[PDB]
Amino acid sequence: CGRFAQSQTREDYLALLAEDIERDIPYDPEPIGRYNVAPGTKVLLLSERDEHLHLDPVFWGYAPDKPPLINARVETAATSRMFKPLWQHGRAICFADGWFEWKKKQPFFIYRADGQPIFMAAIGSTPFERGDEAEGFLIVTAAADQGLVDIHDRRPLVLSPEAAREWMRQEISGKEASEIAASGCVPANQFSWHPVSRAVGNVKNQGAELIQPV
């Protein structure tokens, strides 16, 4: 991973995940408007606490002198001496319209064919609401599958609405979350993708045109 888009309104991302009464996410009509979300920024991140869903601005990155870690591989995170406590106690969801990968260098934008948002599995340091500058969150990744293999060898673990909701529940163990991550992963045949402009490579560019096909 390394870049995605999160441009629509909060209500757009939440419609599939939670009824009104389950959220504590104050209403904001403004689209998030970020077409080019980069590591090392604060990113609105979804998680469960006190029986409700909350949306907090959380640093994308996690450092134990080098740049912070931004991904956790699904093959090793649940058993990782560094990450397994976060797998057990820091699960979160990072919603997006889609994500970018570069094929060895032409960027592609990958998104759900039904146009619904992608719900990326994340792990991070709870409590997320403290605004930590070093212990933030990471995007869990998986091996590229099906057609995604001709673009790049890794992909974000994307979860179904059902699986994403269950992923976030406090009371499920790391073992149950491992079962959820496997069965609930959105397989690549549910995605469409197209090349986009190379301008997305510059984090300074943030226009809506960055996700349009070229």
What CATH number is attached to the domain comprising 182? Answer: 3.90.1680.10
Using alpha carbons, select from 120, 127, 139, 172 the residue that is nearest to residue 13: 120
Using alpha carbons, select from 157, 152, 148 the residue that is nearest to residue 186: 157
User: Which H, E and C letters describe the chain, residue by residue?
Assistant: CCCEEECCCHHHHHCCCCCHHHECCCCCCCCCCEEEECCCCEEEEEEEECCEEEEEEEEECECCCCCCECEEECCCHHHCCCCHHHHHHCEEEEEECEEEEEECCEEEEEEECCCCCEEEEEEECCCHHHCCCCECEEEEEEECCHHHHHCCCEEECEECHHHHHHHHCCCCCHHHHHHHHHHCECCHHHEEEEECCHHHHCCCCCCHHHHCCC
Using alpha carbons, select from 61, 150, 152 the residue that is nearest to residue 99: 152
Catalytic site includes residue 176: no
Cα–Cα distance, 62 to 132 (Å, whole number): 10
The resolution in angstroms reads: 2.1
Quick one: tokens of 41?
């920024």
Quick one: tokens of 50?
């006190």
Catalytic site includes residue 101: yes
| Nearest-5° Cα angle at 65, 59 to 69 | 40
Q: Are 121 and 100 in contact (CB under 8 A)?
A: no
Which residues precede gaps in the chain, with C-N > 2.5 A? Answer: 64, 104
Number of domains the chain is built from: 1
Q: Max CA-CA distance within the chain?
A: 46
Q: Are 36 and 203 in contact (CB under 8 A)?
A: yes
**Residue at token pair 């408007």:** 33
Q: Are 69 and 138 in contact (CB under 8 A)?
A: yes
Name residues whose C-beta falls within 8 Å of residue 107's C-beta, 6 or more positions apart in sequence.
Answer: 100, 101, 195, 196, 197, 198, 200, 201
Considering the candidates 48, 101, 135, 166, report the single residue annotated as catalytic: 101
Cα–Cα distance, 152 to 110 (Å, whole number): 12
Q: Are strands 4-6 and 34-37 parallel, antiparallel or unpaired?
A: antiparallel
Q: Which domain holds residue 38?
A: 1-214
| Nearest-5° Cα angle at 97, 210 to 25 | 125
Cα–Cα distance, 83 to 66 (Å, whole number): 18
Considering the candidates 1, 48, 94, 135, report the single residue annotated as catalytic: 1
